[PDB]
Write a protein that binds this ligand. Structure first.
Ligand SMILES: C[C@]12CC[C@H](O)C[C@H]1CC[C@@H]1[C@@H]2C[C@@H](O)[C@]2(C)[C@@H](C3=CC(=O)OC3)CC[C@]12O
Length: 122
């Protein structure tokens, strides 16, 4: 189910496995930053592109997430949840913090939609 897939993914990212995380997306699957920070795209259509975006992730930062607080949905293939992320820039130093809310949509064990809200000012 979606909640299962989401936790899996977040774990993969915590482990720095960006290809894995990427791989969890349906080929024509989409990543979105509804409130994108400046200098970044806001939609990433297709696994290849999502991968291209996330490729560099582990090189600049390492993240650790709080446990997702999901809200109960009807559809088991839709998950809506809030969670926090703390990052440490490989620079290094740089502690970086995020408070998310996301709408995940899955099918046959793959991620179709990853809509990740966060504060672009912050
Ligand atoms: C917007 C962001 C800001 C920090 C850094 O400059 C990289 C950019 C692009 C990549 C972006 C970070 C913030 C982070 O919170 C992210 C949203 C983070 C993610 C968490 C998640 O569940 O999906 C992606 C990993 C990296 C991230 O995807």
């Amino acid at each position: 189910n979606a909640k299962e897939i989401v936790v899996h993914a977040l774990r993969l990212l915590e482990n720095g496995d960006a290809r894995g995380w990427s791989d969890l997306f349906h080929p024509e699957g989409v990543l979105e930053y509804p409130y994108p920070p400046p200098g970044y795209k806001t939609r990433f259509e297709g696994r290849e592109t999502i991968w291209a975006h996330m490729r560099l992730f582990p090189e600049y930062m390492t993240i650790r997430f709080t446990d997702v607080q999901f809200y109960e949905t009807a559809d088991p293939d839709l998950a809506i949840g809030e969670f926090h992320g703390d990052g440490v820039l490989t620079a290094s130093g740089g502690k970086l913090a995020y408070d998310y809310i996301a709408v995940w949509r899955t099918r046959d064990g793959q991620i179709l939609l990853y809509r990740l809200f966060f504060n672009p000012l912050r």
